[PDB]
């Protein structure tokens, strides 16, 4: 309802995602809001 599914995450940026995930991990510099 708030997730874009197919977006990117970063150390300084993150999408809303109410059901999906944000791959803003400590070992990543470009994640992705997607469904689990």
Contacts of 13 by beta carbon, 8 Å cutoff, 6+ apart: none
Give me 6's structure tokens: 């197919």
SS3 at position 9: strand
CA atoms 15, 6, 3, 32: torsion sign: negative
Task: Determine contact, residues 33/20, Cβ cutoff 8 Å.
Answer: yes
Q: Which residues pair with 33 in a beta bridge?
A: 7
Experimental method: NMR
Residues 9/30, Cβ–Cβ less than 8 Å = yes
End-to-end CA distance of the chain: 14
d(CA 35, CA 11): 20
Domain count along the chain:
1
Q: Which of 27, 25, 15 is nearest to 5 (CA)?
A: 15
Cα distance between residue 29 and residue 1, in whole Å:
25
Our separate counts of H helices and E strands in the chain read 0, 2
Domain span including residue 8: 1-36
């Amino acid at each position: 309802q708030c997730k874009p599914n197919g977006a990117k995450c970063t150390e300084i940026s993150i999408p809303p995602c109410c059901s999906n995930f944000c791959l803003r991990y400590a070992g990543q510099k470009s994640g992705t809001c997607a469904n689990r």
